[PDB]
Amino acid sequence: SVSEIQLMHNLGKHLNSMERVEWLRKKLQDVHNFVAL
């Protein structure tokens, strides 16, 4: 897409408002491990 670099157009699986709040819930069990398991 065009203009996809606004902070890398702060993209993350099309992170929206309800996706960023759930994102943060996943980043809570990630910031001290960084593993998808």
Residue ranges of the domains in the chain? 1-37
Can you tell me which residue has the tokens 């408002």? 17
> How was it solved?
NMR
Q: Which residues contact 19 (CB under 8 A, 6 or more apart)?
A: 12, 13
Residue 12 near residue 23 (C-beta atoms within 8 A): yes
From its phi and psi, is residue 28 left (phi > 0), alpha (psi between -120 and 50) or beta?
alpha
Residue 9 near residue 3 (C-beta atoms within 8 A): yes
Residue 11, amino acid: L
